Write an enzyme that holds these catalytic residues in place. Structure first.
Site, mmCIF file in Angstrom:
data_model
loop_
_atom_site.group_PDB
_atom_site.id
_atom_site.type_symbol
_atom_site.label_atom_id
_atom_site.label_comp_id
_atom_site.label_asym_id
_atom_site.label_seq_id
_atom_site.Cartn_x
_atom_site.Cartn_y
_atom_site.Cartn_z
ATOM 1 N N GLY A 1 0.930 -1.598 0.011
ATOM 2 C CA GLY A 1 0.202 0.509 -0.021
ATOM 3 C C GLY A 1 0.428 1.246 0.163
ATOM 4 N N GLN B 1 2.593 10.045 0.693
ATOM 5 C CA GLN B 1 4.271 9.557 0.862
ATOM 6 C C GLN B 1 5.146 9.286 0.157
ATOM 7 O OE1 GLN B 1 2.325 5.625 2.553
ATOM 8 N NE2 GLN B 1 4.019 5.317 3.214
ATOM 9 N N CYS C 1 5.149 0.117 6.774
ATOM 10 C CA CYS C 1 4.793 0.775 6.238
ATOM 11 C C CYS C 1 5.896 1.419 5.820
ATOM 12 C CB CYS C 1 4.027 2.713 7.702
ATOM 13 S SG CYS C 1 3.970 4.278 6.268
ATOM 14 N N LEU C 2 6.232 1.881 4.113
ATOM 15 C CA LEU C 2 6.449 2.592 4.261
ATOM 16 C C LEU C 2 8.158 3.484 4.018
ATOM 17 C CD1 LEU C 2 6.144 0.581 -0.104
ATOM 18 C CD2 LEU C 2 8.162 -0.135 2.032
ATOM 19 N N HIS D 1 -5.270 2.499 6.851
ATOM 20 C CA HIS D 1 -3.622 3.050 7.123
ATOM 21 C C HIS D 1 -3.801 3.776 5.780
ATOM 22 C CE1 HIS D 1 0.763 2.129 7.882
ATOM 23 N NE2 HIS D 1 0.268 2.831 6.560
ATOM 24 N N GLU D 2 -3.891 3.910 5.020
ATOM 25 C CA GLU D 2 -3.925 4.247 4.158
ATOM 26 C C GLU D 2 -4.735 6.109 4.497
ATOM 27 O OE1 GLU D 2 -0.693 4.109 2.289
ATOM 28 O OE2 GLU D 2 -0.261 2.377 2.983
ATOM 29 N N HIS E 1 -2.889 8.216 6.449
ATOM 30 C CA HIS E 1 -1.819 9.347 5.596
ATOM 31 C C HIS E 1 -2.614 10.332 4.591
ATOM 32 C CE1 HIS E 1 1.752 6.976 6.199
ATOM 33 N NE2 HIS E 1 1.154 5.361 5.394
HETATM 34 ZN ZN LIG Z 1 2.199 3.815 5.858
#
Ligand SMILES: [Zn+2]
Length: 169
Positions: A44, A49, A88-89, A130-131, A134
């Protein structure tokens, strides 16, 4: 490959703007987002990000890296929690437990500009939530205890520094 912002970068706190129209620049951003996400690897990635503060999420929950999903201007509503080990990246190589509503409804638009509405459980409910975080300038570390947070932060800055060092080698 687009560079992914890292905690504690303040730009990860930016609240994303709605996508005006699904033009071919956002179609190209989505494909580069997938590329970036697939390379990581991750499952994701929100546009926030990669320092593009618009309401675009790319996602591929498949062990094959061939079930890609796009969510533009999404709305998420719980239909009621469950534990899951989230990473998470933008918090690289840090995984922990967060507890989220386990069933949700998703309304969004796709890359043809059409609207859709789906109900989500399982890995899908965790990931969409989660996304969407962001897009509201939030990270999954915000739900952890602050000693886990500064520790994730010290590890991340280490990891970012090695990645810089790896490029010089
Ligand atoms: Zn993330």
């Amino acid at each position: 490959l687009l560079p992914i912002l890292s905690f504690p970068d303040p730009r990860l706190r930016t609240i994303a703007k709605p996508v005006e129209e699904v033009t071919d620049e956002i179609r190209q951003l989505a494909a580069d987002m997938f590329e970036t996400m697939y390379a990581a690897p991750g499952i994701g990635l929100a546009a926030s990000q990669v320092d593009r503060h618009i309401q675009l999420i790319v996602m591929d929950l498949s062990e094959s890296k061939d079930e890609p999903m796009v969510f533009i201007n999404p709305k998420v509503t719980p239909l009621t929690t469950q534990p899951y080990e989230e990473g998470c990246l933008s918090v690289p190589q840090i995984y922990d437990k967060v507890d989220r509503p386990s069933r949700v409804k998703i309304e969004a638009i796709n890359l043809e500009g059409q609207a859709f509405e789906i109900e989500a459980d399982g890995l899908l409910a965790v990931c969409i939530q989660h996304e969407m975080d962001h897009l509201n300038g939030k990270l999954f570390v915000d739900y952890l205890s602050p000693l886990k947070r500064q520790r994730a932060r010290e590890k991340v800055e280490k990891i970012v520094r090695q990645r810089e060092r790896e490029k010089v080698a």
